[PDB]
């Protein structure tokens, strides 16, 4: 059996297709080393943080919060990070995300025992998973947008590094 994404390569042994977005793409064999549930937690966490980062880059190009423009001046995107270490935003956010990630550490400890689905924090306040097909469709869309947001954040930040303009300042000219 050959992999669907890479037809000239053998299908990975640890990829079953039961997970969302599994087309059998693992040429370097990383799934043989790590637990697949741990790897899927890594992928989902990276993708969700990248989705929030991409949306934040687009919005912070679109508009700024009241008062932020005096603190940061004209040093948008990652240039504010250092500046906000001088202010108290970065430390507060790091503390609260560290709290949330201690509870995520407990959740990962429960994932590794076979008693928790990967990426499952059971956070659905507005009920959307009302049907088991809509659930699969949202899982595939979530994992695809997470990967797309990883590469989109890479593009926005490295283009900001080259130009100093931003993702949407570049498209203005």
């Amino acid at each position: 059996a050959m992999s669907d994404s890479v037809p000239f390569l053998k299908q990975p042994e640890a990829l079953d297709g039961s997970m969302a977005g599994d087309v059998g793409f693992d040429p370097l064999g990383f799934s043989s080393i790590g637990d697949i549930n741990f790897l899927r937690e890594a992928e989902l966490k990276h993708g969700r943080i990248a989705m929030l980062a991409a949306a934040g880059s687009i919005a912070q190009d679109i508009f700024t919060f009241p008062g932020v423009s005096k603190v940061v001046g004209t040093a948008k995107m990652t240039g504010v990070h250092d500046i906000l270490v001088k202010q108290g935003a970065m430390g507060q956010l790091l503390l609260w995300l560290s709290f949330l990630e201690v509870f995520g550490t407990i959740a990962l400890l429960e994932t590794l025992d076979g008693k928790r689905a990967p990426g499952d924090f059971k956070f659905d306040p507005l009920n959307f998973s009302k049907n088991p097909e809509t659930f699969k469709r949202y899982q595939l869309a979530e994992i695809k947008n997470g990967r797309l947001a990883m590469m989109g954040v890479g593009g926005m930040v490295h283009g900001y590094f080259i130009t100093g303009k931003g993702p949407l300042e570049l498209l203005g000219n």
Binding site: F8, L9, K10, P27, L28
Partner: protein
């Protein structure tokens, strides 16, 4: 095989006083009999075949490229490259990359992407050298579906032959430069 026993395969002897090794089989595309130095005994046959195919394909892209590079140039290359071509350009690209010029980073982009592709298709070589179902040269790359039947066979022969021809061509197109400069059509005419 395409014209097995006439154009390739069994029976054909290229050098009559230096027979090819009997380990070298007669059902590999391109076997005519020509291994006078017995170099197929010093390496794995899958590695040798796939190395020949990769050397040939790189030479084919290079020869075609050489001709066109000496003939048609993309818009705005004249501002960076100018009147230079071929073996110089690579070098001075690095010199431009050494100078600080933030727009001459072409050869680094191509080394990045080609190295990434080589790293990701290296395990295809690794199952190929264990007698797997993938044959040397087979990346299953047929978008247009033209070689979908027996027509493949003929193509295989012709491809490997053009590869060897391309392997010669670049050397001329390089070494004729290293004495004189210029380019393939500037040296022809």
């Amino acid at each position: 095989l395409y014209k097995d026993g006439v154009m390739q395969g069994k029976g054909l002897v290229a050098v009559p006083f230096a027979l090819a090794p009997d380990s070298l089989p007669a059902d590999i595309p391109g076997y005519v009999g020509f291994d006078p130095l017995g170099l197929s005994t010093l390496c794995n046959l899958d590695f040798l075949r796939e190395a020949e195919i990769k050397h040939g394909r790189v030479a084919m892209l290079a020869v075609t490229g050489s001709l066109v590079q000496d003939v048609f140039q993309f818009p705005g290359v004249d501002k960076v490259i100018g009147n230079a071509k071929m073996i110089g350009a690579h070098d001075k690209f690095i010199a431009g990359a050494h100078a600080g010029d933030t727009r001459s980073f072409a050869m680094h982009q191509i080394i990045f992407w080609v190295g990434l592709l080589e790293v990701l298709t290296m395990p295809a070589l690794f199952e190929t050298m264990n007698g797997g179902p993938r044959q040397p040269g087979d990346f299953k790359f047929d978008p247009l579906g033209l070689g979908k039947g027996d027509k493949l066979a003929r193509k295989q022969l012709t491809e490997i032959k053009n590869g060897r021809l391309a392997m010669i061509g670049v050397g001329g197109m390089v070494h004729h430069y290293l004495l004189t400069g210029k380019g393939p059509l500037q040296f022809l005419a």
